[PDB]
Structures are given as structure tokens and as C-alpha cells.
Amino acid sequence: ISVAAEPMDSKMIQDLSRNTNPRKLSKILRTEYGWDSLASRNVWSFYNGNVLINDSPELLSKYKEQIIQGFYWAVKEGP
Amino acid sequence: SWRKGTAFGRHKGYINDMTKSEYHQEFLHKHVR
Amino acid sequence: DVEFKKKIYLVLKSSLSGDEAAHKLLKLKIANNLKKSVVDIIIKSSLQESTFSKFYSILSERMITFHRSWQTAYNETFEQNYTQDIEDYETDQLRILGKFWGHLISYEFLPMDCLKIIKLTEEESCPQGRIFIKFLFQELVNELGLDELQLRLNSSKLDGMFPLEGDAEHIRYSINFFTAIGLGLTEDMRSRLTIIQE
Amino acid sequence: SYNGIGLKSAKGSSTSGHVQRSLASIETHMEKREIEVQVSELRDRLEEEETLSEEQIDKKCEALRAKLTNEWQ
Amino acid sequence: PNEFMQFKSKEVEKAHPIRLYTRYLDRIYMLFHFEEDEGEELTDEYLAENPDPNFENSIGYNNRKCWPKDSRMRLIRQDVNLGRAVFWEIQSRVPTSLTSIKWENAFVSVYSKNNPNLLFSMCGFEVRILPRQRMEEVVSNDEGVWDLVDERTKQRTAKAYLKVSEEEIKKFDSRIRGILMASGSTTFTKVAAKWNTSLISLFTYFREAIVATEPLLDILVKGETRIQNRVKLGLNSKMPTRFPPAVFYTPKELGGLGMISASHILIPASDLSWSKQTDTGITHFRAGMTHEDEKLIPTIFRYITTWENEFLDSQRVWAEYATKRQEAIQQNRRL
């Protein structure tokens, strides 16, 4: 469950702080912010301010909402 | 082991009278030293 | 200058802590043309008493930490005291004055560059001056230990009392002086003199 | 008591209450990521230009992946 | 026989937890030094004989309420259980039919990794000992601190901070109250001489411990105001313009009362929401006894040599006397 962390861009965190399916998101991210295709197609969900990126598809989508609720419970109260 | 040299250790309401009460004795031991 | 000297002295005696006397001196708002004289009143009133008290140290430390001009005044009065006025004083007066400046050097409100002026030889040392250097390093040892005092002496240079280049006789004289004091800070001069004798 | 310093009252202490302020105070991982990116790109391309059927895109993607693997030892 | 708290060797000193002992009139003073083994063994003996899972050992723990909250013993549960184990072992060693060693009159203070202060109150001196390694920044402090020189390596290794104990402050307040009360119809010079007697007896006992003490300075200012109003209500007029400071502190030969001043100082004032938490610096000064004149009346504490500055000098002059006596025996001359 080894996960890295990168900073959000300043323009991207500003555009996300005004709280602004997947093909529209992928096209907007790839043609606006300069994203990888593998990073743009593989996203679980957006809590506000902070994104969750993927890098066995049954084992991924089997606990989709469980990973996303754990992500929510993590970013609500940090380390 | 350090306490076995001595001679002592763990190894070895209400009544109606006011002058005879518990509080009055606590008082007089508080205020005569 | 009697009534201003009286006013400074009664500021120093109508106080309780050194903090309070520092407040009462700094409320007087004395310009630069009398600050050296105020520091001299503080010195000459610390030396009245029988033993040295910490009051004058706490005072002088707050005075130094208030403004740069008081720190320059204490620089100039330490230089003035050692180069001029040690001929005046009794050994008791030099106990008070030596522990005063030792408590000011040990908490680094006076620099080590303020001890730079002392060069102790046979001809430049008063005997009162030697007893004063003894009391300085006695207070410095009792405040700072031997190790931190070695590290502070090795922070900057003191060519006078520690002649690293020096002469074959002044090193031996400083060795015998600092062993008559009883420091144990001697082994660098020992290595240098054993180099020089061969 | 201005700034919470002074007295409750001047009355009681029998002082003036004149409070004054004191003047004394990994490489493998990277490779994997790259591969993923490549795959994504391929997928995008497929989407853009004639790949409504899955088998084609999947095939091409697979091939790409294989190539990537070959490249990285 | 040994001198007071001296030992014949280091091996006899470390052979027992009770390192130092002294007894006053009826106050004992036991300094212990436990290892990690013996302290937790005694603590688990206590917790097996007096169990408390509700952790109410901090409730009712007598703690020095004069020091700030970082200064006195913090109620760390390991050290509170250790201290109650200590007092339980000491309470077990004497029958109650000989003396009533109760917890109420007992102050236990545990220097450890969590409480860097060793507290006691001997002879009216609230002393807080704090090492040079357990302070973050070594700060030169007031006249009321003591420099504890290690007699091994000749270095100042701890700072003992002094305050006057609250019992002795209340006793001094009661003494000035008795000076007021016995002066029914008494001359003004005898009221001044009683104030001088009790003031000298206060400041030549508690010499430097009054700088770091706030209630004693408060009661000094109030009490010297009481003595001045004892003089002025003998004249049925207490106007400040009518009575300068020159009518009280003028000595008894010039015709004045010869009162000794201890209340024309500035009382150190600090934030009384913060002062009961940390060692606040002296950030403000409340005016002690303001007169309309700018008379800087000298105070007695500046003319009394403080105790550390007496005791270092005492060791010096008695070393000089023992050396002169050894020489005069070597010179065979009577000194």
C-alpha cells in the first residue's frame, strides 16, 4: 500500500479551491495543467484540495469505496 | 532488601459534643503550633 | 558632578533587584556624555560593600542588553579599570571587581575581544593586576568549568596572556602564573615551550 | 489591570498601582510509472482515432506494454 | 565521626537508597536516590498494598503552591506513585503512638526525567534546586538564586532558587499586626523601633529570598503603610503632603522616627494569569509607596550582604584563617 506524495501546483490548487464523467476530467487535466495520461485516466476521487492517483483491476475496484473512505478519514485528520 | 535493617515497616463519623469533636481537635492541632 | 553622582548612587540603592535598578537607570534617559561615568559609579559602588553581590551583575547585564552604547561603555570601562585604576584598589576591592567582570565575561555580555588588551609580562603586570587576573579566571572557572572555558579561550586570540608565538621566558612566566592560580589550562603552552627549548 | 498586569484595585494594596513597563526586558518504480503513462497515451490515441471496439485498443496497448517490458530488461 | 552529610567513601554512600538525612526540631528531610529497579519495586509494592486504578494519587498530593506550574513538581503519575510509595515506606517505619507522620503535613518532591526540580522548604526557605543540565538556556538570575558549586570539579552545577515560605510570610504579617495591636498608646519612636526590629529580623534572616517572593513584598508595603498610619493616626491626620518621607526615615538623633525603608522599592509585577504557570521575567513594575516627592529612599536590602555572598566569603576568610593559623604554628608565634 506504498504511496508517494507530490505537491499540487499553485494554479491547480487555486482552480481546485473554487471546487471546479472521466473523459471530460481527463481532457481538461491533460490540456490545461500538463498531466500524464496514466495519471489522468487513473484517479479514484477528489476530496477538496487533494487528489488520489493510481499507478490487478478486480483487487483495485473491489475495495474502491473502502479505499476512498480511508482516504477521506486520512485527509480529514492528518498525521 | 534495603528496608530489612530497621525495626518497623511493612515487612515486619460524628459525635454530638463540640469540644470533643473531630473538627475541634483538627482545629486545635492547626492553631497552637 | 556631585548631585548627579548622588542621584545615580541613590538609584542603585533605592532598588531591590538588579532588574529594578536597571529600570530606574534607564528611566533617567542619560545621554552618551555621562554613560561612562554612570558605569564608573556602578563599579565604585559595587566595590564599597564587603563582598561581591550579584545585584550589580544583574544590573550591568540588563544595561548591556538594553542598548549598544552601554555595551561600548562597559568595554571602555573594563579597559579603563585594568589599564589605569588597579593601582588604587585593595585586594578586597579587587575581589569584588574581579568577580564582577568575571560574571560579565562568563555570560558573554563582554566579548573575549574585551580581554584582548591584557598582556601580562614582568614589566606590564601590576601585582594588584596579577591578583585581578587571578580573580577573573577564578570566577570564569567557577562559572564555566574548564572545558567550556578552554573552548571560549580558543574561540578568539589572546596573544598577551597566552603567548602562542611569544618568547621562551614569557611562556614560562604565564605557565607559572596560571599554575599559581591553579587552572590546568597549561598544556598548550607546555607543548609550545617544549618545541621552543629544543 | 491594563494588559492583565496591574492590580485588582489600588485600594487594598495601599500602593499607587502605577504599573510601568520594565526597560530591562526507486528506478523500477519510475520505469513502471513511465510504462503506465505510455499505456495511457496509447489509450487516448485509440479513443481519438478509430477504436470503438475494445479488442483492437487492448491489443495495441498490450503490444506497447510488451515493448516497454523488453526495453526495461 | 563524619561532618554533616560527609561520608568515608563513595561505596558506603551508594550502598543504600537513603542518601542524605537531616532532622530539624520536628521536621525530617530525607533525600533518596533510586535506581530504575528499586523505585519501581517500591512503587509496585505500594500499588499492590494501596491499589488505585482511578489514578487519584494526584488528588490530595501536597505540592508547593508558591512556585509556578512549570517550577513545582508536575503531577506525573509515575513520579506521584513513586513519591507516595516513598512516604508510605517512611510512614510504615514509625508507630503512630510515637508520632503522627501524616500525609497532610508532608511535602514530597521527586526529581526525575519528568520533574527537573527538586523542591523543599527548610527553615522558611522555599528552595527549588534545578541543575545546569536540566535548563534549556543558562540564564544569569536574581540575587535570590544560589550557585551550587560541585565540590568535586569546582564548577557551578545547579541553581537553587529561594523564596520565603508562606508560613513565615504569615508569621511576619502577624508580627507586624502585633506591633500595631500592642501599640495602643505607645510613643511614635517605639513604633518605629518595633518596625525596625521586626524588619531587620526579617531581612537578616531571609536575606536574598525576598527578591523572588511576591507576597512578602506585598505584605512589606502594606505593613510599612500600616506603621506610617499608626504614626499618623496618633496625630489624627494621614495626609501624604502633611507627612513627607523625611519625617519617618530621618534617624532618631535628628529627631525623626528612624524607620528603616523596605517599601520604597518597585514591586515586580507580571501577568497574574501567566505568573501562576511559568517563571515570568520581571516585565513590569508596580510602584511600592509613591510619595509626591521624588525621594529615592534607600532600602535595607542593599545594605545587607546576601547569604551566598556571605558563605562564599566565609569559606574564603576561614581558609585564610586556617592558613594563617597553620603558619603561625609553623612560625611559633601567637596570632
XYZ file of C-alpha atoms in Angstrom:
718
model
C 0.000 0.000 0.000
C 3.154 2.043 -0.627
C 2.047 5.534 -1.680
C 4.124 8.605 -2.512
C 3.147 12.272 -2.255
C 3.713 15.277 -4.504
C 2.690 18.921 -4.126
C -0.210 20.391 -6.046
C 0.537 23.218 -8.449
C -0.317 26.730 -7.286
C -2.617 27.396 -10.236
C -4.128 23.926 -9.842
C -4.748 24.334 -6.112
C -6.313 27.741 -6.823
C -8.558 26.243 -9.508
C -9.468 23.389 -7.153
C -10.206 25.689 -4.195
C -13.109 27.073 -6.253
C -14.389 23.420 -6.425
C -14.148 23.171 -10.214
C -17.531 11.718 -16.026
C -13.874 10.651 -16.554
C -13.215 11.696 -20.167
C -14.068 15.357 -19.553
C -11.833 15.371 -16.457
C -9.013 13.648 -18.341
C -9.233 16.054 -21.283
C -9.348 19.153 -19.045
C -6.404 17.947 -16.928
C -4.318 16.869 -19.924
C -4.957 20.026 -21.955
C -4.786 22.518 -19.057
C -2.233 21.530 -16.421
C 0.176 19.295 -18.347
C -0.664 15.857 -16.938
C 0.458 12.365 -17.768
C -2.122 10.194 -19.477
C -1.520 7.408 -16.949
C -2.001 9.916 -14.141
C -5.143 11.383 -15.727
C -7.010 8.168 -16.551
C -6.178 6.586 -13.175
C -7.829 8.702 -10.451
C -10.098 7.381 -7.705
C -11.812 10.535 -6.427
C -11.421 14.181 -5.384
C -11.716 15.380 -1.887
C -11.285 19.142 -1.995
C -7.679 20.319 -2.137
C -6.143 16.874 -2.561
C -6.305 14.169 -5.227
C -5.730 10.405 -5.207
C -3.880 8.889 -8.166
C -3.374 5.257 -9.167
C -0.091 3.968 -10.576
C -4.978 -6.349 -10.909
C -8.153 -4.352 -11.622
C -10.520 -6.597 -9.651
C -8.460 -6.084 -6.490
C -8.436 -2.329 -7.127
C -12.155 -1.856 -7.767
C -13.174 -4.464 -5.163
C -12.388 -2.034 -2.334
C -12.953 1.200 -4.286
C -15.225 2.965 -1.816
C -13.305 1.469 1.124
C -10.012 2.988 -0.124
C -11.809 6.273 -0.792
C -13.393 6.353 2.688
C -9.989 5.587 4.200
C -8.540 8.422 2.108
C -11.286 10.717 3.428
C -10.687 9.635 7.037
C -6.946 10.172 6.499
C -7.076 13.636 4.942
C -9.702 14.800 7.427
C -7.291 14.266 10.344
C -3.631 14.190 9.373
C -0.548 12.632 10.948
C 16.283 -5.685 50.582
C 17.202 -2.156 51.669
C 14.481 -1.893 54.334
C 15.268 -5.052 56.335
C 17.725 -3.324 58.686
C 15.239 -1.281 60.710
C 12.746 -2.246 63.439
C 9.426 -1.287 61.814
C 7.889 -1.484 58.375
C 5.545 -3.399 56.139
C 7.944 -6.350 56.176
C 7.583 -6.526 59.965
C -18.225 9.956 61.774
C -19.988 12.321 64.160
C -20.438 12.779 67.901
C -22.608 15.449 69.476
C -20.007 17.057 71.768
C -18.375 20.012 70.056
C -15.270 20.278 72.246
C -14.754 16.505 71.987
C -15.434 16.526 68.233
C -13.094 15.605 65.405
C -13.175 19.063 63.804
C -12.305 20.853 67.042
C -9.265 18.641 67.573
C -8.243 19.273 63.948
C -8.706 22.974 64.737
C -6.579 22.967 67.879
C -3.823 20.990 66.191
C -3.985 23.538 63.374
C -3.742 26.674 65.541
C -1.426 26.120 68.532
C 1.926 25.386 66.878
C 29.394 66.395 39.401
C 28.278 65.517 42.926
C 24.479 65.657 42.769
C 24.211 63.588 39.588
C 26.599 61.070 41.142
C 24.385 61.130 44.229
C 21.319 60.568 42.037
C 22.880 57.569 40.263
C 24.003 56.101 43.596
C 20.575 56.508 45.187
C 19.053 54.905 42.116
C 21.396 51.996 42.801
C 20.403 51.864 46.484
C 16.636 52.502 46.348
C 16.216 49.314 44.310
C 15.607 45.698 45.240
C 16.696 43.565 42.282
C 19.228 44.338 39.588
C 16.297 44.448 37.168
C 14.708 47.283 39.149
C 17.904 49.323 39.346
C 18.363 48.835 35.610
C 14.825 50.131 35.072
C 15.493 53.145 37.278
C 18.730 53.973 35.455
C 17.122 53.591 32.042
C 14.168 55.777 33.031
C 16.617 58.641 33.663
C 17.405 58.720 29.888
C 21.082 59.594 30.180
C 22.869 60.737 27.024
C 26.240 59.388 25.884
C 28.212 62.142 27.630
C 27.618 60.596 31.070
C 27.132 56.849 30.485
C 30.793 56.020 31.155
C 30.546 57.994 34.387
C 27.380 56.075 35.326
C 29.200 52.783 34.735
C 32.038 54.126 36.899
C 29.539 54.922 39.675
C 28.191 51.357 39.338
C 31.754 49.991 39.632
C 32.805 52.226 42.518
C 29.557 51.481 44.363
C 29.884 47.734 43.867
C 33.320 47.947 45.491
C 32.048 49.769 48.608
C 30.438 46.650 50.013
C 32.250 43.939 51.933
C 31.651 41.110 49.476
C 30.592 40.952 45.865
C 26.843 40.646 45.342
C 25.050 39.541 42.189
C 22.900 42.721 42.126
C 25.495 44.717 40.207
C 25.951 41.860 37.725
C 22.195 41.565 37.035
C 22.102 45.356 36.728
C 25.021 45.533 34.290
C 23.693 42.638 32.211
C 20.333 44.343 31.743
C 22.140 47.623 30.972
C 24.270 45.897 28.319
C 21.276 44.123 26.777
C 19.326 47.382 26.550
C 21.475 49.339 24.118
C 24.741 49.215 22.191
C 26.104 52.367 23.843
C 26.065 50.811 27.310
C 27.942 47.821 25.881
C 30.581 50.163 24.450
C 30.639 51.907 27.836
C 31.363 48.625 29.614
C 34.059 47.815 27.027
C 35.701 51.181 27.688
C 35.382 50.927 31.469
C 36.875 47.431 31.636
C 39.810 48.688 29.567
C 39.959 51.786 31.785
C 39.879 49.779 35.022
C 42.606 47.312 34.034
C 44.915 49.802 32.347
C 44.574 52.550 34.959
C 42.904 52.001 38.281
C 44.159 48.672 39.654
C 46.920 50.643 41.420
C 44.240 52.276 43.599
C 42.460 49.246 44.923
C 42.848 46.963 47.930
C 42.718 43.174 47.471
C 39.095 43.166 48.714
C 38.136 45.829 46.166
C 39.756 43.651 43.513
C 37.807 40.598 44.726
C 34.573 42.497 44.065
C 35.777 43.983 40.768
C 37.284 40.730 39.502
C 34.209 38.643 40.206
C 32.070 41.414 38.677
C 33.916 41.319 35.385
C 34.194 37.532 35.566
C 30.424 37.243 35.832
C 30.161 39.615 32.877
C 32.668 37.710 30.716
C 31.361 34.236 31.590
C 27.871 35.068 30.326
C 29.460 36.658 27.191
C 27.984 40.132 27.573
C 31.514 41.372 27.401
C 33.406 39.897 24.431
C 36.618 37.947 24.592
C 37.894 40.875 22.497
C 37.489 42.908 25.708
C 40.128 40.738 27.407
C 42.346 41.347 24.357
C 44.024 44.360 25.994
C 45.652 42.358 28.809
C 49.291 41.476 28.112
C 50.865 40.066 31.277
C 54.670 40.208 31.484
C 57.112 41.092 34.243
C 57.079 44.807 33.375
C 53.429 45.284 32.354
C 51.740 43.463 35.254
C 50.907 45.248 38.445
C 50.884 42.833 41.398
C 47.376 44.135 42.018
C 46.808 43.461 38.321
C 48.013 39.875 38.695
C 45.647 39.339 41.624
C 42.869 40.831 39.460
C 43.609 38.392 36.614
C 43.565 35.633 39.245
C 40.100 36.693 40.388
C 38.831 36.985 36.797
C 39.863 33.454 35.925
C 38.698 32.188 39.322
C 35.196 33.464 38.545
C 35.496 32.208 34.946
C 36.467 28.708 36.102
C 33.732 28.546 38.742
C 31.137 29.743 36.220
C 32.104 27.890 33.053
C 34.096 24.796 34.034
C 37.452 24.051 32.488
C 36.145 22.646 29.193
C 33.822 25.475 28.137
C 36.434 27.980 29.288
C 39.011 26.272 27.047
C 36.518 26.469 24.183
C 35.878 30.163 24.822
C 39.609 30.909 25.024
C 40.084 29.047 21.741
C 37.253 30.999 20.092
C 39.421 34.095 19.553
C 43.011 35.120 20.236
C 44.660 36.333 23.447
C 48.298 36.844 22.490
C 49.182 38.538 25.780
C 48.190 36.072 28.482
C 48.529 33.126 26.056
C 51.708 33.695 24.034
C 51.441 31.011 21.344
C 54.163 32.661 19.275
C 55.625 34.521 22.291
C 59.043 34.150 23.876
C 60.858 31.366 25.702
C 60.504 33.240 29.018
C 57.043 34.823 28.856
C 55.508 31.409 28.164
C 57.206 30.063 31.304
C 56.044 33.105 33.283
C 52.440 32.653 32.131
C 52.715 28.925 32.941
C 53.898 29.645 36.472
C 51.263 32.382 36.874
C 48.358 30.190 35.736
C 49.623 27.316 37.884
C 49.928 29.654 40.865
C 46.280 30.408 40.141
C 45.627 26.702 39.647
C 43.852 26.496 36.306
C 45.173 23.451 34.487
C 44.847 25.222 31.116
C 48.579 24.964 30.656
C 49.359 22.100 28.267
C 49.281 24.160 25.050
C 51.992 26.443 26.442
C 53.760 23.278 27.631
C 53.850 21.828 24.112
C 54.941 25.190 22.681
C 57.757 25.630 25.212
C 58.974 22.060 24.680
C 59.112 22.886 20.971
C 60.989 26.136 21.695
C 63.607 24.709 24.113
C 64.885 22.216 21.519
C -5.261 45.993 35.172
C -4.172 47.099 31.710
C -2.763 44.107 29.751
C -3.725 41.899 32.708
C -0.696 43.152 34.638
C -1.945 45.559 37.281
C -3.892 45.143 40.472
C -7.492 44.263 41.106
C -7.679 47.641 42.835
C -5.364 50.350 44.048
C -7.399 50.087 47.247
C -6.203 47.126 49.265
C -2.544 47.116 48.325
C -2.036 50.652 49.737
C 0.204 51.324 46.735
C -0.287 53.780 43.922
C -0.853 50.973 41.443
C 1.402 52.782 38.957
C 2.374 49.759 36.905
C 5.104 50.816 34.491
C 6.812 48.707 31.870
C 10.300 47.450 32.591
C 13.096 48.815 30.437
C 15.212 45.757 31.262
C 13.304 43.147 29.229
C 13.199 3.830 -6.951
C 14.263 3.256 -10.581
C 11.971 0.270 -11.116
C 9.042 2.307 -9.802
C 9.914 5.149 -12.173
C 10.066 2.713 -15.087
C 6.666 1.306 -14.134
C 5.217 4.816 -13.980
C 6.638 5.595 -17.417
C 5.109 2.408 -18.808
C 1.739 3.326 -17.311
C 1.954 6.791 -18.858
C 2.750 5.269 -22.244
C -0.232 2.935 -21.935
C -2.487 5.865 -21.058
C -1.224 7.795 -24.077
C -1.918 4.804 -26.316
C -5.440 4.530 -24.913
C -6.026 8.230 -25.553
C -4.811 7.845 -29.131
C -7.153 4.901 -29.648
C -10.062 6.928 -28.283
C -9.216 9.790 -30.632
C -8.848 7.743 -33.824
C -10.970 4.693 -34.716
C -11.183 2.343 -31.720
C -14.823 1.951 -30.651
C -14.138 -1.792 -30.359
C -12.141 -2.812 -27.294
C -10.152 -5.700 -28.750
C -8.097 -3.501 -31.068
C -7.136 -0.912 -28.452
C -6.466 -3.625 -25.875
C -4.288 -5.493 -28.369
C -2.285 -2.395 -29.285
C -1.961 -1.443 -25.620
C -0.761 -4.951 -24.780
C 1.829 -4.768 -27.553
C 3.038 -1.407 -26.251
C 3.341 -2.837 -22.744
C 5.339 -5.782 -24.073
C 7.660 -3.414 -25.931
C 8.169 -1.373 -22.769
C 8.986 -4.525 -20.813
C 11.504 -5.562 -23.462
C 13.131 -2.133 -23.302
C 13.476 -2.350 -19.494
C 15.483 -5.618 -19.419
C 32.617 10.798 63.218
C 31.644 12.394 59.949
C 30.877 16.023 59.389
C 27.353 16.916 58.318
C 26.467 14.939 55.148
C 30.026 13.709 54.679
C 30.946 10.089 54.042
C 34.035 7.950 54.394
C 33.780 6.626 50.829
C 31.693 6.568 47.678
C 30.914 2.871 48.192
C 29.211 3.465 51.545
C 27.325 6.418 50.025
C 25.703 4.496 47.161
C 25.037 1.351 49.217
C 21.546 2.455 50.278
C 18.692 4.497 48.783
C 18.528 6.928 51.730
C 21.415 9.136 50.641
C 21.014 12.139 52.911
C 19.121 12.647 56.123
C 18.706 15.545 58.445
C 16.223 16.309 61.176
C 15.273 19.772 62.380
C 13.222 20.299 65.592
C 10.363 18.119 64.351
C 10.825 18.274 60.564
C 12.718 15.458 58.876
C 14.388 15.859 55.486
C 15.099 12.622 53.625
C 16.896 12.683 50.273
C 16.695 9.366 48.420
C 18.258 8.366 45.105
C 16.602 5.364 43.489
C 17.727 3.305 40.538
C 15.244 2.179 37.894
C 14.866 -1.159 39.710
C 14.280 -0.222 43.354
C 11.935 2.684 42.661
C 9.525 0.641 40.559
C 9.805 -2.247 43.034
C 8.766 0.032 45.912
C 6.089 1.562 43.677
C 4.622 -1.831 42.799
C 4.670 -2.796 46.489
C 2.642 0.357 47.180
C 0.256 -0.271 44.286
C -0.252 -3.846 45.467
C -0.936 -2.662 49.024
C -2.818 0.544 48.084
C -4.326 -0.047 44.631
C -5.713 2.930 42.723
C -6.644 2.338 39.069
C -8.656 5.592 39.147
C -5.282 7.432 39.341
C -6.391 9.708 42.187
C -2.895 9.768 43.693
C -2.533 13.279 42.246
C -5.662 14.316 44.150
C -4.518 15.331 47.613
C -0.829 15.348 46.665
C 0.745 18.204 48.624
C 2.581 20.349 46.108
C 4.397 23.664 46.527
C 1.723 26.199 45.598
C 4.105 29.168 45.688
C 6.221 28.161 42.705
C 4.824 28.460 39.158
C 3.312 25.440 37.458
C 6.410 24.563 35.451
C 8.516 25.165 38.563
C 6.925 22.905 41.160
C 6.647 19.118 40.842
C 4.451 18.300 37.877
C 1.917 15.604 38.747
C 3.463 12.883 36.604
C 1.737 9.632 37.539
C 4.952 7.582 37.656
C 6.585 10.107 39.977
C 3.445 10.678 42.075
C 3.150 6.916 42.617
C 6.865 6.807 43.463
C 6.501 9.659 45.953
C 3.517 8.085 47.675
C 5.411 4.776 47.794
C 8.287 6.653 49.457
C 6.077 8.304 52.048
C 4.234 5.027 52.631
C 7.513 3.226 53.356
C 8.571 6.043 55.695
C 5.157 6.091 57.408
C 5.429 2.338 57.994
C 8.722 2.691 59.887
C 7.406 4.584 62.937
C 4.353 3.700 65.064
C 1.652 6.356 65.289
C 1.846 6.058 69.094
C 5.264 7.766 68.892
C 4.495 10.450 66.308
C 1.715 11.179 63.823
C 3.536 11.276 60.488
C 0.578 12.175 58.259
C 0.437 12.900 54.549
C -1.132 16.324 55.195
C 1.993 17.911 56.690
C 4.322 16.146 54.238
C 5.814 17.582 51.053
C 7.384 15.001 48.745
C 9.231 16.104 45.612
C 10.678 13.701 43.052
C 13.486 14.828 40.758
C 13.337 12.538 37.739
C 13.334 12.619 33.950
C 9.923 14.338 34.062
C 10.242 16.690 37.058
C 13.530 18.607 36.705
C 13.045 20.465 40.026
C 13.916 19.188 43.491
C 11.743 21.131 45.926
C 11.841 21.614 49.665
C 11.096 24.221 52.329
C 13.686 24.285 55.094
C 13.689 26.896 57.887
C 11.294 29.127 55.967
C 13.241 28.974 52.692
C 11.265 27.532 49.796
C 14.215 26.160 47.818
C 13.917 24.818 44.274
C 17.067 23.144 43.067
C 17.500 22.936 39.304
C 20.657 21.659 37.562
C 22.667 23.267 34.787
C 21.893 20.305 32.531
C 18.123 20.456 33.095
C 17.819 24.069 31.945
C 17.493 24.844 28.257
C 19.167 28.270 28.384
C 21.528 29.037 31.262
C 20.286 32.474 32.349
C 22.014 34.593 34.964
C 19.311 35.255 37.518
C 18.368 37.362 40.524
C 20.068 37.880 43.879
C 17.745 35.218 45.335
C 19.373 32.334 43.491
C 22.223 30.250 44.842
C 25.157 28.990 42.827
C 25.673 25.372 43.885
C 29.334 24.662 43.269
C 30.166 20.987 42.906
C 32.848 20.201 45.487
C 34.328 17.595 43.130
C 35.062 19.593 39.969
C 34.750 23.207 41.279
C 32.018 24.231 38.810
C 28.587 25.794 39.359
C 26.399 22.793 38.543
C 22.982 23.723 39.938
C 20.913 26.802 40.739
C 18.943 26.702 43.971
C 16.185 29.297 43.772
C 14.953 30.834 47.015
C 11.580 32.125 48.118
C 10.258 32.819 51.582
C 7.770 30.198 52.741
C 4.133 31.201 53.090
C 4.052 30.183 56.756
C 6.868 32.610 57.553
C 5.230 35.358 55.492
C 2.034 34.910 57.509
C 4.108 34.906 60.707
C 5.743 38.201 59.705
C 2.320 39.656 58.872
C 1.103 38.541 62.296
C 4.200 40.093 63.870
C 3.555 43.484 62.252
C -0.089 43.105 63.268
C 1.074 42.532 66.837
C 3.242 45.642 66.575
C 0.121 47.583 65.585
C -2.033 45.959 68.252
C 0.277 46.246 71.266
C 0.725 49.930 70.340
C -2.451 51.124 71.997
C -0.931 54.252 73.497
C 2.742 53.934 72.617
C 5.213 56.644 71.565
C 5.965 57.085 67.882
C 9.659 56.280 68.252
C 8.815 52.954 69.895
C 6.518 52.051 66.984
C 9.398 52.938 64.675
C 11.822 50.860 66.746
C 9.443 47.891 66.692
C 9.196 48.237 62.907
C 12.990 48.414 62.655
C 13.406 45.382 64.924
C 10.957 43.205 63.011
C 12.205 44.478 59.651
C 15.860 43.754 60.466
C 14.787 40.370 61.841
C 13.010 39.713 58.561
C 15.743 40.874 56.207
C 18.729 39.487 58.097
C 17.155 36.020 58.143
C 15.586 35.670 54.695
C 18.249 37.867 53.092
C 18.144 37.215 49.358
C 14.994 35.049 49.403
C 12.791 38.172 49.384
C 13.672 39.278 45.840
C 11.910 36.328 44.229
C 8.972 36.498 46.660
C 5.853 38.453 45.728
C 3.544 38.088 48.809
C 6.312 39.074 51.211
C 6.947 42.284 49.258
C 3.192 42.931 49.160
C 2.919 42.490 52.923
C 6.058 44.633 53.420
C 4.476 47.525 51.524
C 1.165 47.057 53.332
C 2.886 46.733 56.706
C 5.073 49.803 56.350
C 1.930 51.664 55.304
C 0.299 50.321 58.492
C 3.207 51.604 60.581
C 3.070 55.038 58.936
C -0.678 55.141 59.558
C -0.063 54.104 63.160
C 2.138 57.186 63.422
C -0.323 59.389 61.537
C -3.466 58.217 63.342
C -1.711 59.157 66.545
C -1.896 62.639 65.030
C -5.453 62.157 63.630
C -4.311 63.211 60.146
C -2.919 60.886 57.474
C -2.364 63.335 54.634
C 0.574 62.494 52.335
C 1.569 66.124 51.761
C 1.490 66.744 55.512
C 3.858 63.823 56.152
C 6.897 63.662 53.856
C 9.203 60.644 53.795
C 11.605 62.899 55.668
C 9.532 62.646 58.866
C 9.793 58.866 59.148
C 13.170 57.794 57.801
C 15.065 60.640 59.458
C 17.160 58.881 62.140
C 16.432 59.078 65.848
C 19.245 61.527 66.595
C 17.992 64.200 64.173
C 14.519 63.970 65.744
C 12.740 61.764 63.219
C 11.465 58.262 63.780
C 14.369 56.396 62.240
C 12.156 53.974 60.365
C 14.038 51.700 58.011
C 12.660 51.591 54.478
C 11.855 48.355 52.732
C 8.806 49.513 50.746
C 10.016 52.346 48.517
C 11.113 49.703 46.016
C 9.216 48.917 42.854
C 7.368 45.645 43.373
C 7.994 43.324 40.400
C 4.677 42.919 38.623
C 3.927 40.386 35.919
C 0.943 38.770 34.235
C -1.118 37.148 37.004
C -2.690 34.762 34.516
C 0.796 33.718 33.380
C 2.676 34.107 36.680
C 0.927 31.091 38.187
C 2.111 28.994 35.214
C 5.717 29.838 34.273
C 8.741 31.691 35.589
C 7.816 35.038 34.071
C 10.511 37.611 33.601
C 10.054 40.818 35.517
C 8.205 42.618 32.747
C 6.519 45.388 34.739
C 6.989 47.295 37.981
C 4.192 48.309 40.310
C 5.092 51.340 42.398
C 5.592 50.429 46.040
C 4.893 53.521 48.160
C 4.752 56.606 45.968
C 5.151 59.985 47.593
C 4.597 63.218 45.667
C 8.290 63.986 46.119
C 10.969 62.200 44.090
C 12.736 60.982 47.232
C 14.751 57.875 46.355
C 14.710 56.389 49.851
C 17.466 53.767 50.258
C 16.388 50.280 51.177
C 17.873 47.975 53.776
C 18.359 45.020 51.406
C 21.072 46.901 49.520
C 22.969 47.320 52.804
C 22.798 43.661 53.828
C 25.150 41.126 52.284
C 23.130 38.230 50.836
C 23.683 34.679 52.033
C 25.543 33.196 49.048
C 27.750 36.272 49.089
C 28.285 35.671 52.809
C 29.020 31.956 52.519
C 31.493 32.066 49.637
C 33.231 34.851 51.555
C 33.030 32.773 54.732
C 34.768 29.832 53.075
C 37.387 32.268 51.764
C 38.105 34.015 55.065
C 38.124 30.792 57.062
C 40.522 29.250 54.558
C 42.650 32.365 55.114
C 42.344 31.999 58.888
C 43.211 28.296 58.906
C 46.202 29.019 56.668
C 47.378 31.901 58.878
C 46.908 29.711 61.966
C 48.861 26.827 60.411
C 51.605 29.313 59.519
C 51.588 30.917 62.984
C 52.015 27.459 64.491
C 54.808 26.898 61.952
C 56.210 30.339 62.826
C 55.651 29.531 66.555
C 54.141 32.999 67.025
C 50.811 33.732 68.675
C 48.437 35.173 66.083
